[PDB]
């Protein structure tokens, strides 16, 4: 009875050991939190992973129908058992039923689903690249010289600073189109309209596949994505980028920089100033790192430090 179960718990603990050194099979970003409890029937008691909404998990293997093996992408965190989407759904359902059981008959009805309202189902996990692609936004719009040059200086810095550990590539499709819901069912989102779009969804899909593949061996991935000027353009995709905001805090400074480029750039001052203002209006949490340093070496050092910390989070020594 309890010897069979001491045993099958030894098989699972052996598989968990072995998983420390497997490659990352795939990564997810969660849409739900999970607090394990003993009744969850974790294959090794006490070794489920706790996580919150929007955490990142690297998955080594699917252990069985109910459990995966992997780790939170965070320094010090080691592999453990992670509930599969199936298991999370079964636990969620039990949690709703147990809520009804514990309810007080003195309670009144809940606030109603308002009639006819359409909701997209959100799965507990979204598959994301195993290394979050680094995308630069700011100080103003891409395709103008102040922004393009300042961004180029930073990727040039990264190319040498993380040589042997990084891929830097230009994205050839408008990746803002890669909405999780559109990519997951393209025929459900056909909209007949007149628009200035330049990429097909097939092209966008090939690009997303290429990005995932660059990240599979856990090298840093940086993208020159020229259509992406604002983090909201990617927040509904399953790219989960690291958004790096190059921030010129003083718009008077930006105006003078644009003017330094000559009349052919400063005739577009207004559009560039407006874009810079929009980034400055953004809640700071839509950025992963804000570089507001006025020296290139200083902005570089800050970004490199962040990326070294991200390297540590993605490459544990037990790997």
């Amino acid at each position: 009875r309890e010897a069979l179960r001491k045993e099958a718990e030894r098989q699972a603990l052996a598989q968990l050991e072995k998983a420390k050194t497997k490659p990352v099979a795939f990564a997810v970003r969660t849409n739900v939190g999970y607090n394990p409890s003993p009744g969850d029937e974790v294959p090794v008691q006490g070794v489920a992973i706790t996580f919150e909404p929007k955490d990142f998990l690297h998955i080594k293997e699917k252990y069985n129908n109910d459990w995966w093996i992997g780790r939170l992408v965070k320094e010090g965190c080691e592999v453990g058992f992670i509930p599969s989407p199936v298991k999370l759904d079964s636990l969620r359902l039990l949690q709703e039923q147990t809520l009804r059981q514990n309810r007080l008959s003195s309670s009144k009805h809940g606030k109603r689903i308002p009639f006819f309202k359409k909701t997209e189902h959100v799965p507990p996990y979204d598959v994301v690249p195993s290394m979050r692609p680094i995308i630069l936004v700011g100080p103003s719009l891409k395709g103008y010289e102040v922004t393009d040059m300042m961004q180029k200086a930073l990727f040039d810095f990264l190319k040498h600073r993380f040589d042997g550990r990084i891929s830097i590539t230009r994205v050839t499709a408008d990746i803002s189109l890669a909405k999780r819901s559109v990519l997951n069912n393209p025929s459900k989102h056909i909209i007949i309209e007149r628009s200035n779009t330049r990429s097909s969804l097939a092209e966008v899909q090939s690009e997303i596949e290429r990005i995932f593949e660059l990240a599979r061996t856990l090298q840093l991935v940086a993208l020159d994505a020229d259509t992406i000027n604002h983090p909201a353009q990617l927040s509904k995709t399953s790219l989960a980028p690291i958004i790096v905001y190059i921030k010129i805090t003083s718009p008077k400074v930006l105006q003078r920089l644009i003017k330094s480029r000559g009349k052919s750039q400063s005739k577009h001052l207004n559009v560039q100033i407006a874009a810079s203002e929009k980034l400055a209006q953004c809640p700071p949490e839509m950025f992963d790192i804000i570089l507001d340093e006025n020296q290139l070496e200083d902005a570089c050092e800050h970004l490199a430090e962040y990326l070294e910390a991200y390297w540590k989070a993605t490459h544990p020594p037990s790997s």
Partner: peptide
């Protein structure tokens, strides 16, 4: 004084992006 320093630093940054 900060404007002047910002301009000098960011102008240098731009050149390095050439």
């Amino acid at each position: 004084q900060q404007l002047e320093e910002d301009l000098r630093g960011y102008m240098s940054w731009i050149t390095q992006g050439e």
